[PDB]
Amino acid sequence: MKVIFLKDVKGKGKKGEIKNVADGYANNFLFKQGLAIEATPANLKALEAQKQKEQR
Numbered sequence: 659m660k661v662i663f664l665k666d667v668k669g670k671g672k673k674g675e676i677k678n679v680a681d682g683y684a685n686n687f688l689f690k691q692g693l694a695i696e697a698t699p700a701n702l703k704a705l706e707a708q709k710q711k712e713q714r
Contacts (some may be wrong), residue, residue: 659684660697662705667693689697 659704671679671688673706676697679688688694691694 659689660702662686662697662701663688663694665693674708676702676705700708 659678659681660676661671661679662674662676663679664674666672666687671677671693678684678697679694680686684694687698689696
């Protein structure tokens with residue numbers, strides 16, 4: 659369960675940072691609450707697209 663922490667945690671996770679936490683922790687704490695989400699293309703993309711500004 660790669661994990662996109664949407665916010666930082668106890669000095670471990672970081673804003674929308676994608677890394678796998680405890681493959682199950684990911685969905686049993688960060689996802690079911692408000693720390694991260696199941697790293698998935700559906701979302702992972704937005705994390706980068708959200709960083710699009712004026713370069714085209």
